[PDB]
Amino acid sequence: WGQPFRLRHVTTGKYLSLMEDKNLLLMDKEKADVKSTAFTFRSSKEKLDVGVRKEVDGMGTSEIKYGDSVCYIQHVDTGLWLTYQSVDSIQRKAIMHHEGHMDDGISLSRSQHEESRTARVIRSTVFLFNRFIRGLDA
Amino acid sequence: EIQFLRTDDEVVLQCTATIHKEQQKLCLAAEGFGNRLCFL
Structure with a gap:
């Protein structure tokens, strides 16, 4: 809890980021400048902000659990919280809001190694084939 | 204590x-x- 990280979309290869004008958006690898792409899992939505955690040179202690634990995604730089637009399959746009909503809890479901392999193969193949198609068009 | 590299470990080869x-x-x-x- 409190550890900064980046969320990379496997299929597109782009990193989640927060621009002030158009909230959440995916950005290329060369424009992920940590300030806008840093996100954090929070146990509770209350403004604790303990911070000042010392990094441990080891595997650490397991804190966040798959499925059971309820997470709250918070932008590191701005402190904003991930929440839904609540107005329109489901197609509910995700926005940054300072106080969020009553139900912003997020569960985590791990993917299989085969599934992750297939997703990264898909992204590499679409990149290479788009390059080939553009070369043929040229 | 100084940690050692075991077999079943995930590592990255780094250079300067x-x-x-x-x-x-x-x-x-x-x-x-x-x-x-x-x-x-």
Whole structure:
């Protein structure tokens, strides 16, 4: 809890980021400048902000659990919280809001190694084939 | 105590490069799919 990280979309290869004008958006690898792409899992939505955690040179202690634990995604730089637009399959746009909503809890479901392999193969193949198609068009 | 490298461990090969009077850290990488060569 409190550890900064980046969320990379496997299929597109782009990193989640927060621009002030158009909230959440995916950005290329060369424009992920940590300030806008840093996100954090929070146990509770209350403004604790303990911070000042010392990094441990080891595997650490397991804190966040798959499925059971309820997470709250918070932008590191701005402190904003991930929440839904609540107005329109489901197609509910995700926005940054300072106080969020009553139900912003997020569960985590791990993917299989085969599934992750297939997703990264898909992204590499679409990149290479788009390059080939553009070369043929040229 | 000083930690050691066991077999079943995940590691990254890292090196340093001195270019235009600065030091840059580079990790060995490879794609495996559609490209067998290794880059940094």
